[PDB]
UniProtKB/Swiss-Prot annotation:
Glycans are attached at N47, N170. Changing V164L: In strain: RA. This is Cruzipain. Disulfide bonds join C22-C63, C56-C101, C155-C203. The chain holds residues 123 to 337 of 467 of the full protein. Purified cruzipain is able to degrade itself, yielding a complex mixture of small peptides, and a major 25 kDa fragment. It comes from Trypanosoma cruzi. Changing T186A: In clone 1800-2. Hydrolyzes chromogenic peptides at the carboxyl Arg or Lys; requires at least one more amino acid, preferably Arg, Phe, Val or Leu, between the terminal Arg or Lys and the amino-blocking group. The cysteine protease may play an important role in the development and differentiation of the parasites at several stages of their life cycle. The active site is at C25, H162, N182.
Length: 215
């Protein structure tokens, strides 16, 4: 695979968002992945709706957590593949309470047809990402609250408790790293991103990697 990849160089990644006090990391991870895959399929980069998932996907648990793979399945199996635009279904859970689902008044911004679940292998995830784009991953982010920059070598790696988005990597650095988009505003981390060491399953990053499929 290439020595380094960063899908921001393609303009494929939307701005960093703010999940607020809702436990909706799973939705930001899944939607961020869809946004990138939709762009990479040859469509304008579009902000898509986390709130659709948080409110409407009853296989996941709203502001009390969820799984990106469940979200992808809900979109295809219960929502006809459709993902509404953020503009037409804006986020309304920042205080920690998700409103009930509404089915009317929204605009379809993307469609997915399925999702892939990738091997539990950092090199194979990296190789897939190099060709096919950003990858949703579960991580242990329990130690991340005060991260301000650098390559996190120090990740607790005990329990998956967060979903984030791999957008690239750099295998050439002395400590190789993944490049991860978080959903805690651009005031956290490196303009809202984090680099974690790559190759030692830091933060359990290899355990639950997946991507939506467009087309």
């Amino acid at each position: 695979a290439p020595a380094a990849v960063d899908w921001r160089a393609r303009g494929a990644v939307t701005a960093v968002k703010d999940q607020g006090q809702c436990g909706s990391c799973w939705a930001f991870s899944a939607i961020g992945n869809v946004e990138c895959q939709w762009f990479l399929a040859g469509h304008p980069l579009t902000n898509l709706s986390e709130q659709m998932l948080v409110s409407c996907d009853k296989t996941d648990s709203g502001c009390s957590g969820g799984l990106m793979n469940n979200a992808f399945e809900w979109i295809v199996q219960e929502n006809n593949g459709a993902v509404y635009t953020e503009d037409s279904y804006p986020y309304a859970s920042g205080e920690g309470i998700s409103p009930p689902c509404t089915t009317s008044g929204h605009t379809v911004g993307a469609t997915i047809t399925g999702h892939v679940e990738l091997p539990q292998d950092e090199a194979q995830i990296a190789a897939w990402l190099a060709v096919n784009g950003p990858v949703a991953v579960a991580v242990d982010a329990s130690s991340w609250m005060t991260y301000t920059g650098g390559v996190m070598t120090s990740c607790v790696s005990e329990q998956l408790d967060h979903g984030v988005l791999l957008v690239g990597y750099n295998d050439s650095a002395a400590v190789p790293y993944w490049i991860i988009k978080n959903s805690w505003t651009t005031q956290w981390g490196e303009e809202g991103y984090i680099r974690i060491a790559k190759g030692s399953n830091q933060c359990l990053v290899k355990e639950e990697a997946s991507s939506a499929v467009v087309g």
